[PDB]
Amino acid sequence: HHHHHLVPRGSNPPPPETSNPNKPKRQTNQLQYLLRVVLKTLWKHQFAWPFQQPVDAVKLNLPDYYKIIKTPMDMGTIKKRLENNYYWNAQECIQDFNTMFTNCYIYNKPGDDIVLMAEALEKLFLQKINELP
Numbered sequence: 001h002h003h004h005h006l007v008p009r010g011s012n013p014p015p016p017e018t019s020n021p022n023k024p025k026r027q028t029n030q031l032q033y034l035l036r037v038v039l040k041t042l043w044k045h046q047f048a049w050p051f052q053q054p055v056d057a058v059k060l061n062l063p064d065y066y067k068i069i070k071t072p073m074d075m076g077t078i079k080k081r082l083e084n085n086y087y088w089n090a091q092e093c094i095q096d097f098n099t100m101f102t103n104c105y106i107y108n109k110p111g112d113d114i115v116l117m118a119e120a121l122e123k124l125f126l127q128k129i130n131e132l133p
């Protein structure tokens with residue numbers, strides 16, 4: 001039989017939403033600081049690039065990524081959420097950062113390059129979080 005299951009193909013999931021008109025939203029001083037200070041300083045770091053967009057499991061050849069990670073998050077998504085005033089409070093934004101870092105540690109092993117990158121960025125994140133208004 002000549003059906004060899006070379007189709008249908010894999011794919012990346014739809015990325016997390018960055019707009020939601022019926023979601024409650026505010027601008028707070030903490031959320032402005034999270035954009036202006038926390039996100040933008042992390043974004044410029046040389047270890048930021050793996051985290052600047054949703055994981056492209058196809059390009060990166062990580063076909064098990066979304067088998068393991070069911071709540072993906074990345075700083076590109078977070079950056080757009082802050083720019084779109086998506087959040088109600090600082091906690092919602094911070095939980096996105098926590099999710100991103102947690103996904104990295106779940107999927108990978110201690111000592112992997114990606115984990116070392118996440119640890120460094122997390123250490124910085126936590127330092128900047130302590131200067132929150």
Ligand SMILES: CCNS(=O)(=O)c1ccc2c3c(cccc13)C(=O)N2CC
Binds near residue numbers: 060062104107113114
């Ligand atoms: C160390 C960078 N390696 S990569 O560009 O192949 C990559 C980018 C983003 C990743 C990963 C992950 C695992 C392994 C490699 C890798 C991963 O969890 N992410 C999202 C932070």
